[PDB]
């Protein structure tokens, strides 16, 4: 009910060179409010800390990365002339007082850096039903999901059961597989998984529906290829049950 | 002097109901106060613990950790653990104007699988998808998946279901390919898996 840390944007996909401006509210009553860069290659790396309008600490980023605090603690930061390497989730982090007080993340504001906008593609999303030898085996069913041929990885799936958003039997894996290990924008993979009881399956009323909601490309996004632009878009498919 | 936060094991796997132990370690001792987060895949973080420089531990339902200041140490204690302590674990320290993270502790608790029953099933064809789709399922734990001989087959690792009003926990892995020498047969033939493993007639 009460709102945690807030931030915006969720994902972003821009060129080298370019410049972003990213944004994050404190949980009310939080006066402190810090940032950082996480990556793979180097972890999370603080760039600065805000209070009451000023900063009061610093990192050891170089001045392309700069920050503000607004009189009701809202805080900004932004990276100029990005290059490959900025490609990070950006975390910020409230407090009342850093000092004594713990830290409060908000979920970060996922940026890639790339090339070309021409390496950005949405997921194919595809449901396999379940095999007849499990269901007579174990009386229970596994669809698959998988998302394939996406770049970047900015991609959230979800399950659906008669309309209803089900956590109960389902695992996504918790990191995509890079399509072609050795090129650094490969486009990704990821699978998952719901299962259900045979009876459940065998009733031709329930409705099964794998979502992957892929963050792209902005509308001020030139684009002048042939194929479809690669917006921010849903790709879904779906499944209903079957007797016998 | 330079901070250096260390944090080991790099990575633990354990089975659920066991006790855990997390290492920290800081080189500069003067430090404000020491703090423990965890995270998720796909998240930010989650503070667990503070403890204040003056001091010696907290504590916070299964989760204990100690401070000893001058040592330059922090341990966390997660007793009896649980699959949903599964994340990747961060020591932090304040320091009096700069602050610190540890590369984290990625933790994997792996449920007892009480009745193993493994089997590599063959999925339907989509009719949107050229994909031939495999399942490898109900194993126990101590099972490892491997990647295949093939660099266009894709294999996942193990994944734990929950059919939380059945009380059933399930492990599994997929394996996809659109070439067409590839069989369900043939696509776990990397991995080291049960001899009893179960595979249907096609």
């Known amino acids: 009910m009460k709102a945690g840390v807030t931030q915006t944007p969720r994902y972003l996909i821009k060129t080298r060179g370019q410049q972003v401006t990213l944004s994050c509210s404190p949980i009310?009553?939080?006066?402190?409010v810090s940032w950082y860069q996480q990556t793979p290659g180097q972890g999370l790396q603080f760039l600065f800390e805000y209070f009451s309008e000023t900063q009061r600490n610093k990192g050891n980023f170089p001045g392309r990365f700069s920050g503000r605090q607004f009189s009701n603690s809202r805080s900004e930061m932004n990276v100029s002339t990005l290059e490959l390497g900025d490609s990070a989730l950006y975390l910020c982090?409230?407090?009342?007082?850093?000092?004594?007080?713990?830290?409060?993340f908000g979920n970060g504001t996922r940026l890639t850096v790339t090339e070309d906008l021409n390496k950005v593609f949405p997921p194919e999303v595809a449901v396999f039903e379940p095999s007849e030898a499990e269901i007579s085996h174990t009386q229970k069913a596994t669809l698959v999901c998988l998302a394939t041929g996406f770049f970047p990885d900015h991609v959230e799936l979800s399950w659906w059961v008669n309309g209803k958003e089900v956590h109960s039997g389902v695992c996504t894996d918790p990191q995509p597989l890079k399509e072609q290990p050795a090129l650094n924008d490969s486009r990704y993979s990821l699978s998952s998984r719901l299962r259900v009881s045979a009876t459940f399956w065998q009733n031709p009323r329930n409705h099964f529906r794998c979502q992957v909601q892929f963050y792209g490309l902005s509308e001020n996004d030139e684009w002048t290829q042939d194929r479809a632009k690669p917006v921010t878009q849903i790709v879904s498919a779906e499944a209903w049950g079957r007797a016998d | 002097m330079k901070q250096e936060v260390t944090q080991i094991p790099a990575a633990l796997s354990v089975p659920e109901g066991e006790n855990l132990v997390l290492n920290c370690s800081f080189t500069?001792?003067?430090?404000?106060?020491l703090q423990w987060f965890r995270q998720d895949p796909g998240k930010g973080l989650t503070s667990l613990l503070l403890?204040?420089?003056?001091?010696r531990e907290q504590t916070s339902g299964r989760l204990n950790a100690s401070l000893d200041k001058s040592s330059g140490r922090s341990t966390l204690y997660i007793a009896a653990s649980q699959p949903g302590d599964s994340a990747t674990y961060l020591c932090?320290?304040?320091?009096?104007?700069?602050?610190?993270f540890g590369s984290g502790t990625k933790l994997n608790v792996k449920p007892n699988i009480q009745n193993p029953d493994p089997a590599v099933y063959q999925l339907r064809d989509s009719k949107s998808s050229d994909k031939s789709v495999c399942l490898f399922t109900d194993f126990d734990s101590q099972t490892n998946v491997s990647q295949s001989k093939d660099s266009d087959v894709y294999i996942t690792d193990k994944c734990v279901l929950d059919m939380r009003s059945m009380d059933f926990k399930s492990n599994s892995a997929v394996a996809w390919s659109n070439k067409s020498d590839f069989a369900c047969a043939n696509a776990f033939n990397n991995s080291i898996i049960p001899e009893d493993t179960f595979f249907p007639s096609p």
């Open positions: 500069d001792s003067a430090i404000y106060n």
């Open positions: 009310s009553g939080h006066r402190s």
């Open positions: 403890i204040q420089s003056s001091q």
């Open positions: 932090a320290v304040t320091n009096f104007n700069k602050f610190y």
């Open positions: 982090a409230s407090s009342f007082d850093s000092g004594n007080s713990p830290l409060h």
